[PDB]
Design an enzyme around this catalytic site. Structure first.
Site, short mmCIF file in Angstrom:
data_model
loop_
_atom_site.label_atom_id
_atom_site.label_comp_id
_atom_site.label_asym_id
_atom_site.label_seq_id
_atom_site.Cartn_x
_atom_site.Cartn_y
_atom_site.Cartn_z
N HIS A 1 0.90 -1.24 -0.07
CA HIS A 1 -0.03 -0.10 0.11
C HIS A 1 0.89 1.38 0.13
O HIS A 1 0.10 2.33 -0.31
CB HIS A 1 -1.09 -0.09 1.32
CG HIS A 1 -0.61 0.01 2.50
ND1 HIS A 1 -0.33 -0.91 3.12
CD2 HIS A 1 -0.15 1.19 3.09
CE1 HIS A 1 0.20 -0.52 4.50
NE2 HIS A 1 0.35 0.75 4.36
N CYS B 1 4.18 2.00 9.18
CA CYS B 1 3.94 0.89 8.49
C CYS B 1 5.47 0.36 7.88
O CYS B 1 6.26 1.36 7.41
CB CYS B 1 3.02 1.20 7.23
SG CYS B 1 1.34 1.23 8.06
N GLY C 1 2.92 6.34 9.71
CA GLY C 1 4.46 6.36 9.31
C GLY C 1 5.17 5.24 9.70
O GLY C 1 6.27 4.87 9.25
C1 LIG Z 1 0.62 2.85 7.85
O1 LIG Z 1 -0.05 2.88 6.39
C2 LIG Z 1 1.67 4.05 7.59
O2 LIG Z 1 2.06 4.24 8.70
N1 LIG Z 1 1.78 4.73 6.40
C3 LIG Z 1 2.59 5.59 6.29
C4 LIG Z 1 -0.91 2.73 8.39
C5 LIG Z 1 -0.32 2.54 10.02
C6 LIG Z 1 -1.62 2.91 11.01
C7 LIG Z 1 -1.92 4.57 11.18
C8 LIG Z 1 -2.21 4.73 12.48
N2 LIG Z 1 -1.85 3.63 13.14
C9 LIG Z 1 -1.40 2.72 12.36
O3 LIG Z 1 -0.93 1.54 12.74
N3 LIG Z 1 -1.73 2.07 8.07
C10 LIG Z 1 -3.02 2.35 7.59
O4 LIG Z 1 -3.13 3.59 7.64
C11 LIG Z 1 -3.84 1.40 7.03
C12 LIG Z 1 -3.48 1.31 5.39
C13 LIG Z 1 -4.32 0.32 5.09
C14 LIG Z 1 -4.09 -1.38 4.99
C15 LIG Z 1 -3.89 -0.44 3.59
N4 LIG Z 1 -5.36 2.01 7.06
C16 LIG Z 1 -5.65 2.83 6.21
C17 LIG Z 1 -7.03 3.09 6.48
C18 LIG Z 1 -7.73 2.65 7.30
C19 LIG Z 1 -7.36 1.98 8.38
N5 LIG Z 1 -7.74 1.29 9.67
C20 LIG Z 1 -8.78 1.90 10.49
O5 LIG Z 1 -8.89 2.89 10.73
C21 LIG Z 1 -9.79 0.79 11.04
C22 LIG Z 1 -10.52 1.32 11.91
C23 LIG Z 1 -12.10 1.58 11.72
C24 LIG Z 1 -12.77 1.98 12.55
C25 LIG Z 1 -12.29 2.26 13.97
C26 LIG Z 1 -11.12 2.26 14.25
C27 LIG Z 1 -10.19 1.60 13.17
C28 LIG Z 1 -5.87 1.40 8.02
O6 LIG Z 1 -5.26 0.78 8.95
#
Ligand SMILES: *[C@](O)(C(=O)NC)[C@H](C[C@@H]1CCNC1=O)NC(=O)[C@H](CC1CC1)n1cccc(NC(=O)Cc2ccccc2)c1=O
Ligand SMILES: [Cl-]
Length: 306
Positions: free
Chosen positions: A41, A145, A143
């Site tokens: 991603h 990931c 950040g």
């Molecule tokens: C990762 O992609 C990153 O660091 N990118 C630079 C992040 C890491 C996340 C951000 C906050 N804490 C973490 O551990 N990963 C994401 O943002 C994922 C990417 C998706 C998998 C391809 N991501 C994106 C969008 C939404 C969500 N999850 C939720 O928000 C689920 C959710 C729904 C309702 C209530 C609470 C949580 C992701 O994980």
């Protein structure tokens, strides 16, 4: 004496962390030999996240669209491929700091160390467990990931986790280094929920043994139980069933302490049914399940890595 949630020394993994940028997105990659591993991603815009077709998105990406930085130097990307939910970026330079390493897919109940990284730079190290519902209770911000989970076997680093996502309840999901998610999770911004967070019964028993080794014995009672009788109570409290394999694995700790596994099960049953009455065990007010039997042996015998 004393007993702490203890991570592996992170030095060997620190030398493998790099920054991967693709258009708008910066996250962490793992540089082993001439390959950089990162979450696929890295190629997605926030729009893309809702319903990504990664194969379609990848067609519009060439080697030069992947910026890979090791400290202040750019690595030249000469190839890329998608394996499950990870990208493999072939670079023209073998990481001179590549340790002895393996990729392992761990079992639920198994523990590992996380090196939380931002922008390819290590921020901190902590110990985790693969929960029975295939989540981890981490500390991850935007950040993080591509941060990795690992165990060390003397000189061999076994990589078992790459960070991908956060779920409701502030729990985390990710893949092995072949890019296969632990549990049913998919790398998409959609309604996903974890499953029941059951307690790792064998790890609670290992931690109770650690307490007795450290002179914390107040919870030992006058009772014994049977596997079947214990499991009847375990089920009610959302504890994993204890098997004869688990009993066998606790053999060395039972030997060390002279307390039969089934005697310790009877002590745990009373703690489940009566609670702790405001007392503590190894300075915890609840039953800790993120120490494996091997974890306890390591800490209580001072096993070392190099
Ligand atoms: C990762 O992609 C990153 O660091 N990118 C630079 C992040 C890491 C996340 C951000 C906050 N804490 C973490 O551990 N990963 C994401 O943002 C994922 C990417 C998706 C998998 C391809 N991501 C994106 C969008 C939404 C969500 N999850 C939720 O928000 C689920 C959710 C729904 C309702 C209530 C609470 C949580 C992701 O994980
Ligand atoms: Cl506590």
């Amino acid at each position: 004496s004393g007993f702490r949630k203890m991570a592996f020394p992170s030095g060997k993994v620190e030398g493998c962390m790099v920054q991967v940028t693709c258009g708008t997105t910066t996250l962490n990659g793992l540089w082993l030999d001439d390959v950089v591993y990162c979450p696929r991603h890295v190629i997605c815009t926030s729009e893309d996240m809702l319903n990504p077709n990664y194969e379609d998105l990848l067609i519009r990406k060439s080697n030069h669209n992947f910026l890979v930085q090791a400290g202040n130097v750019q690595l030249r990307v000469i190839g890329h491929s998608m394996q499950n939910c990870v990208l493999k970026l072939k670079v023209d330079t073998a990481n001179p700091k590549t340790p002895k390493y393996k990729f392992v897919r761990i079992q639920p109940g198994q523990t590992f160390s996380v090196l939380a990284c931002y922008n390819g730079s290590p921020s901190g190290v902590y110990q985790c467990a693969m929960r029975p519902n295939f989540t981890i209770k981490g500390s991850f911000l935007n950040g993080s990931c591509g941060s990795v989970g690992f165990n060390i076997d003397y000189d061999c680093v076994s990589f078992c986790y790459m960070h991908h996502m956060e779920l409701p309840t502030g729990v985390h999901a990710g893949t092995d280094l072949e890019g296969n998610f632990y549990g049913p999770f998919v790398d998409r911004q959609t309604a996903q929920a974890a499953g029941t967070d059951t307690t790792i019964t064998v790890n609670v028993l290992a931690w109770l043994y650690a307490a007795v080794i450290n002179g914390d014995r107040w919870f030992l009672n006058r009772f014994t139980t049977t596997l079947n009788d214990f499991n009847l109570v375990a089920m009610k409290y959302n504890y994993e069933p204890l098997t004869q394999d688990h009993v066998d694995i606790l053999g060395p700790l039972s030997a060390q302490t002279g307390i039969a596994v089934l005697d310790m099960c009877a002590s745990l049953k009373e703690l489940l049914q009566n609670g702790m009455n405001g007392r503590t065990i190894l300075g915890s007010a609840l039953l800790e399940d993120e120490f494996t039997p091997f974890d306890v042996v390591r800490q209580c015998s001072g096993v070392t890595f190099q």
